[PDB]
Amino acid sequence: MNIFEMLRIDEGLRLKIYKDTEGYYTIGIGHLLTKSPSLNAAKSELDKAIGRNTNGVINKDEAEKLFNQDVDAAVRGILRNAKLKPVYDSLDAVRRAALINMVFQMGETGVAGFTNSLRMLQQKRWDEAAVNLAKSRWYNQTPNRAKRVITTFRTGTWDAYK
Ligand SMILES: [Cl-]
Numbered sequence: 101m102n103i104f105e106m107l108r109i110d111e112g113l114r115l116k117i118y119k120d121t122e123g124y125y126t127i128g129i130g131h132l133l134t135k136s137p138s139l140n141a142a143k144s145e146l147d148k149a150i151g152r153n154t155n156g157v158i159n160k161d162e163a164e165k166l167f168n169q170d171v172d173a174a175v176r177g178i179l180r181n182a183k184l185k186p187v188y189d190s191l192d193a194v195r196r197a198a199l200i201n202m203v204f205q206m207g208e209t210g211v212a213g214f215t216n217s218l219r220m221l222q223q224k225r226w227d228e229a230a231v232n233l234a235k236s237r238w239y240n241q242t243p244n245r246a247k248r249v250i251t252t253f254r255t256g257t258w259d260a261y262k
């Protein structure tokens with residue numbers, strides 16, 4: 101298992117514009133297009149992202165390309181972030197995947213706001229961090245995906261995904 105296969109299981113793949121769990125316009129592998137209510141603002145963003153007139157539909161390759169850019173941006177955002185970097189550096193390879201996952205879903209700002217859990221992860225207090233992570237809107241809103249990520253942090257293995 102790796103970060104790509106991990107996120108592909110969590111986000112799924114859709115080749116037509118859809119609305120995410122929060123109601124925002126998304127396409128492909130969890131690629132947020134816009135937070136605006138307008139399907140037209142979404143189609144515009146889409147065409148801009150792909151470099152062609154898409155009429156709201158993309159092919160697999162295009163979806164995968166967006167996905168590659170997004171994972172790359174996620175990692176690089178972690179590395180440039182003063183709060184996140186030290187956490188990432190301290191972690192093993194599996195747990196690094198778990199933080200990348202959170203960043204991909206909720207953005208660098210959002211994750212960086214989990215101050216207490218971050219400190220617990222850094223100290224390698226696994227069970228405590230899992231309990232703290234669960235007291236969040238995140239876990240309450242997407243509990244199945246959250247539990248999987250949390251288990252990855254608790255255990256350090258890919259069990260939740262197998
Ligand atoms: Cl983009």
Ligand SMILES: [Cl-]
Nearest residue numbers: 242243244245
């Ligand atoms: Cl869920």
